[PDB]
Design an enzyme around this catalytic site. Structure first.
Site, short mmCIF file in Angstrom:
data_model
loop_
_atom_site.label_atom_id
_atom_site.label_comp_id
_atom_site.label_asym_id
_atom_site.label_seq_id
_atom_site.Cartn_x
_atom_site.Cartn_y
_atom_site.Cartn_z
N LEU A 192 39.37 -34.54 -49.14
CA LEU A 192 40.65 -34.93 -48.56
C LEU A 192 40.57 -36.32 -47.97
CD1 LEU A 192 41.43 -31.56 -46.75
CD2 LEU A 192 42.32 -32.35 -48.95
N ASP A 305 43.99 -37.60 -27.43
CA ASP A 305 44.14 -38.30 -28.72
C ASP A 305 45.39 -37.82 -29.45
OD1 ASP A 305 43.03 -40.32 -30.42
OD2 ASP A 305 41.74 -38.98 -31.49
C1 LIG Z 1 42.09 -44.78 -40.66
N1 LIG Z 1 41.34 -43.52 -40.92
C2 LIG Z 1 40.18 -43.74 -41.85
C3 LIG Z 1 39.46 -42.42 -42.17
N2 LIG Z 1 40.42 -41.41 -42.69
C4 LIG Z 1 39.77 -40.17 -43.15
C5 LIG Z 1 40.80 -39.18 -43.65
C6 LIG Z 1 41.89 -39.61 -44.44
C7 LIG Z 1 42.87 -38.71 -44.89
C8 LIG Z 1 42.81 -37.34 -44.57
C9 LIG Z 1 43.86 -36.43 -45.14
O1 LIG Z 1 44.77 -36.92 -45.81
N3 LIG Z 1 43.68 -35.11 -44.86
C10 LIG Z 1 44.41 -34.02 -45.36
C11 LIG Z 1 45.20 -33.96 -46.53
C12 LIG Z 1 45.79 -32.75 -46.92
C13 LIG Z 1 45.57 -31.58 -46.17
C14 LIG Z 1 44.77 -31.64 -45.00
N4 LIG Z 1 44.61 -30.44 -44.32
C15 LIG Z 1 43.73 -30.24 -43.23
N5 LIG Z 1 43.72 -28.98 -42.81
C16 LIG Z 1 42.93 -28.62 -41.76
C17 LIG Z 1 42.14 -29.53 -41.14
C18 LIG Z 1 42.16 -30.79 -41.59
C19 LIG Z 1 41.37 -31.88 -40.96
C20 LIG Z 1 41.73 -33.21 -41.20
C21 LIG Z 1 41.01 -34.24 -40.60
C22 LIG Z 1 39.94 -33.93 -39.78
N6 LIG Z 1 39.56 -32.66 -39.53
C23 LIG Z 1 40.26 -31.65 -40.10
N7 LIG Z 1 42.95 -31.16 -42.63
C24 LIG Z 1 44.19 -32.85 -44.62
C25 LIG Z 1 41.68 -36.89 -43.79
C26 LIG Z 1 40.71 -37.80 -43.33
C27 LIG Z 1 41.50 -41.16 -41.70
C28 LIG Z 1 42.25 -42.47 -41.42
#
Ligand SMILES: CN1CCN(Cc2ccc(C(=O)Nc3cccc(Nc4nccc(-c5cccnc5)n4)c3)cc2)CC1
EC number: 2.7.10.2
Length: 452
Positions: A192, A305
């Protein structure tokens, strides 16, 4: 006393089954056979739990004394005692390098002309069993010698004040609890995202359950710091907070949670669905977030945050608070915040950014900023303003204006969230009720336009 141990260092509990203790605390450990983690029971608190075996010494041994440093050289004792922050009279006891069987009391001192220096006093032992620095004053133990010179210098350069501080060693591996799972129970499927500290994946757990898996890149933050996030989520359980499922505490560290199918609220607002949302949908999403934060509030935690990038979305506009990587139980004292906690600056209340005073009221400020992200469908706060100028402007009284098509009553709510004095900001309990009742109590005549 065989089976009694004494703690050499402080240890803070970071799982459900480890034991917090302070240096000097006496603990029963009846099976010290091995492993790096031992089951202990405190003779101070009556608490049971696991402790790192390298943090304790047998209660019989001289090694149980905090001031006993054993076989270190004269020159190494000086290096330790000359620490810039040690008070005059800081001390340790060690083996003598020059007289077999004798000891040495080493003490920090200060010359008014020349500065810090260390004095050393040989401790000899007689046949009778006594210890002495001078023949006229004898003791039956090193412990009694130290006690005496802590009351009176009596010939020494200074009274003994402080036990010489030293580095705390790392534990050997991490403490683990019942949240731990075998890594073989997980299948990684879709990546992701990724960043400086690791990755996030969608996957499957136990062949049946869809999950999100957050992974730690080794050599960046400590495993303990990474898992602080899971420690918080073990305690905070609510329908509008992302749920913890499991952890894997060997590298690479994993945190396993429920999966939210639509990703971050920020990306959701900026994408195609945003074009089709109007005020009722956005206010409902705000109310859900406020309900999650009202729970965080009741539980005496602070998130630190809060922003649309850290809310996750599911089908049917379900919104949940996520990213507990900075969250903390509130304590009735101050602390030196990490330089990074105040960023991003456009969401951070002035008193949090300037003085590190992060409270539930600084989360309320961030929630007001989040309300602007909802009503502008993901625009950056303070448009046209660079990050470096924001704090000064807000401190001088600048607030974002009412977004186009946004009712004045909703902007009035944002402005309450941004009151200079934290105590005058509303509670999340109030915010949830206000937003839930909005279209009956506040804007009963509302009609949608093209944007809101
Ligand atoms: C500037 N910065 C640089 C690094 N970057 C890393 C990143 C970028 C995009 C996603 C994303 O689209 N995640 C996404 C897409 C579709 C579904 C989900 N669902 C999801 N469900 C449960 C938990 C989590 C989650 C997301 C991030 C961190 N921990 C748990 N995500 C997440 C997650 C992490 C973030 C921005």
């Amino acid at each position: 006393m065989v089976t009694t141990f004494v703690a050499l260092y402080d240890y803070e509990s970071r799982t459900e089954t480890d034991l917090s203790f302070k240096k000097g605390e006496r603990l029963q450990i009846v099976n010290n056979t091995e492993g790096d983690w031992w089951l202990a029971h405190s003779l101070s608190t009556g608490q049971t739990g696991y402790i790192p075996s390298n943090y304790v010494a047998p209660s019989d041994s001289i090694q149980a004394e905090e001031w006993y440093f054993g076989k270190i050289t004269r020159r190494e004792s000086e290096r330790l005692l000359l620490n810039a922050e040690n008070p005059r009279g800081t001390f340790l006891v060690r083996e003598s390098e020059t007289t077999k069987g004798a000891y040495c009391l080493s003490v920090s001192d200060f010359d008014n002309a020349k500065g810090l220096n260390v004095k050393h006093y040989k401790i000899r032992k007689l046949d009778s069993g006594g210890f002495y620095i001078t023949s006229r004053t004898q003791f039956n133990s090193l412990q009694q010698l130290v006690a005496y010179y802590s009351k009176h210098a009596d010939g020494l350069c200074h009274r003994l004040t402080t036990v010489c501080p030293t580095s705390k060693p790392q534990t050997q591996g991490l403490a683990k609890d019942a949240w731990e799972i075998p890594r073989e129970s997980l299948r990684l499927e879709v990546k992701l995202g990724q960043g400086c500290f690791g990755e996030v994946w969608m996957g499957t757990w136990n062949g049946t359950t869809r999950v999100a898996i957050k992974t730690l890149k080794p050599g960046t933050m400590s495993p303990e710091a990474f898992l602080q996030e899971a420690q918080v989520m073990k305690k905070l359980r609510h329908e509008k907070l992302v749920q913890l499922y499991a952890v894997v505490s060997e590298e690479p560290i994993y945190i396993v949670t429920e999966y939210m199918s639509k990703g971050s609220l920020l990306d959701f607002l900026k994408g195609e669905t945003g074009k089709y949302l109007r005020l009722p949908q956005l206010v409902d999403m705000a109310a859900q977030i406020a309900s999650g934060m009202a729970y965080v509030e009741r539980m005496n935690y602070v998130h630190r945050d809060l922003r649309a990038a850290n809310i996750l979305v599911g089908e049917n506009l379900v919104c949940k608070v996520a990213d507990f990587g900075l969250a903390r139980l509130i304590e009735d004292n101050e602390y030196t915040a990490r330089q990074g906690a105040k960023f991003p600056i456009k969401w951070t209340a002035p008193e949090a950014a300037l003085y590190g005073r992060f409270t539930i009221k600084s989360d309320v400020w961030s929630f007001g900023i989040l309300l602007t992200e909802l009503t502008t469908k993901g625009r950056v706060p303070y448009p046209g303003m660079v990050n470096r100028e924001v704090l000064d402007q807000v401190e001088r009284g600048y607030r974002m204006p009412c977004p186009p098509e946004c009712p004045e009553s909703l902007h009035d709510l944002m402005c309450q969230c941004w009151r200079k004095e934290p105590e005058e900001r509303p509670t999340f309990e109030y915010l949830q009720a206000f937003l839930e009742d909005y279209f009956t109590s506040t804007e009963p005549q509302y009609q949608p336009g093209e944007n809101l």
